[PDB]
């Protein structure tokens, strides 16, 4: 016979417009509703530069995934 | 003197650093011959040493007027062209040898030293060397870029494995590992980054599940982190730490529950176990195949284990996403005096063997309903030498700290990635054509293509960069213009 | 503490201050022995992790977990007396065998007042640069000799130079007469 | 005899 002394198990947390201002993803910015370009970040979300400018000026985390927002500068 | 130098030396450089019809300059040929003969020019009494001396003094004299200019720039671009030709020859020659990465690193070391000996230590020539290597890696086919990236990922994984597992040969190999990283880091900012990162994730996964996140993985990342475009590996590492924090919180939550129970009972009156640790992984960062899942957890696992798993799932639900359980993991078992270090499936089989004295494979095949290939992989160590299971499919005991884990199987490139890249390319071409002379800001175009997909933003950006290099599209700078 | 009061920072500060105060009210010889034991533990764990293959991962994980209590020594004379023994043991570790030393120093860095341990690693880097310069000098000299003339199977030796500011070497370990105890090619 | 393949010497400066 065998006996278990320890163990480790694994599982995944299985579960798209500009959520922060809720306008359509490709549409314009409600605050100004037309000069906001879209912004991308390392955490792979797309938000309005207006939305993000304000929000970041308030708080310094990604509002969608709880990580320090980093303006994506690859490929640029 | 300013007049004399600007008159005599300058057009001489501007002439000798001009490509011929074949594309070769005089100074280019000179440097090429130097690099070719450097190996055999180590005899103090030989013609080759004299050749090296002549070339060395000529170059030092030509650049000695320096501390842009017109003497620096031309010689710089010539050094660039010669490094590019050399590296491209090498890459075409050996992209399938089982010693490719080490020869690549030897090349980088030898060419950097040659540059320092020739032109002295100066800043811009190192940047020339880097740009040359880059341009050479870009002048390649897609299948070959894929194979090269896979070779890099395998090299890192194999070095870390050897250094951690082995003894003094390890610590020897490890300083070398640190040396060889600076050549690799030239990959950043190129297209190859995405495929290299994809390949790196796939080995870092198994390495983290075979051993906790050691110093080695964090150190390698603190060297080469800015190469990975989306920063996936850092997120896997951070995930392990977040999980330990969650373990702390679960302990506290248990205490609070028990306190409430004690209080209620106290008002009414007033009126030898297996340790288990859980790990949650975000599916945005780990490559967990759908083949690796648990579906009827009670059926395939013992009772108390499932009770603990249910309790933890209850906590995770109450704290806030459901928990999809997997067969990935590692366990330590006791069987006689010896200790066993096995994976999850191995522990499952060996625990099923706690009652019966012989196992027929078809029973377990029906029970698990998992891929029989992974069960074969699990059994091969277990049926191998020093294997507490003997195969006859009949399983029976044959009758030191044993480590029985299925070793890594490096993905052998034969193709799906090429299909994905080509499809993204044509979709982006259609999108650019539809917008005409207006085009878009790049981020808007990424949004459009991602919407049309129903893949990562970085993948689309990689396709965009490859197209730009091909010259189909040009940059206006926020917006991009097709041509 | 986390069970009794929940997650709060002020109680953690109280815990650290309590450990510090407990350490302080001790006789000198006890403090010296304690510092020596701490340094010996760190050295033993690192050396075992480097030589031991199969359980070395466990040792290294335990070391990273256990580093946190030792940070209490920052802001005491124990830091001064502990830097000394860390110097003595790290010298031998560096000579005999690295890359984990920097990792350890990245989190135990504040404890050392005079920062000598980092100075040792800086010294190693300087020695490497010096070797490169030496090679370039040799090539230059050969070039001058060839110009003057034309104007008309071996052991691999690497040399490491140490500074006396931040390196403990006992003068009993010196070598005085090289030709008396060395072959001729090495001496050359 | 006994053959050397590599040596590392150590010096201080005074």
Author numbering:
A (entry chain H): 21 to 35, 40 to 57, 66 to 108
B (entry chain F): 1368 to 1434, 1465 to 1668, 1691 to 1739, 1750 to 1821, 1830 to 1836, 1844 to 1858, 1863 to 1902, 1921 to 1942, ...
C (entry chain E): 1512 to 1608, 1611 to 1665, 1691 to 1726
D (entry chain G): 21 to 34
From the reporting publication:
Accordingly, a cryo-EM map revealed its triangular-shaped assembly with 240 Å-long vertices, measuring 255 Å across, with six inward-facing globular domains. Refinement, applying C3 symmetry, yielded a 4.4 Å resolution map revealing secondary structures for the triangular scaffold. Mass photometry and size-exclusion chromatography–multi-angle light scattering (SEC–MALS) validated the CUL9–RBX1 hexamer (1.8 MDa). One interface involves the cullin element from two protomers. This cullin dimer adopts a boomerang shape. The bends in the three boomerangs are the corners in the triangular hexamer. The second dimerization interface occurs in the center of each side of the triangle where ARM1 domains of two protomers interact. Moreover, AlphaFold2-modeled DOC domains fit into the six inward-facing densities in a manner compatible with the short tethers to the cullin element. Indeed, the hexameric assembly is disrupted by mutants in the ARM1 interface (R125A Y152A), or by eliminating the cullin interface through deleting part of the bridging helix.
However, the vertebrate-specific CUL9 complex with RBX1 (also called ROC1), of interest due to its tumor suppressive interaction with TP53, uniquely encompasses both cullin–RING and RBR domains. However, the vertebrate-specific CUL9 is unique in encompassing two distinct types of E3 ligase within the same polypeptide. With 2,517 residues, CUL9 is the largest cullin and RBR protein, and among the dozen largest E3 ligase subunits, and its structural mechanisms have remained elusive. The CUL9 structure distinctly encompasses both neddylated CRL and RBR E3 functionalities within a single polypeptide, in a giant triangular, hexameric self-assembly.
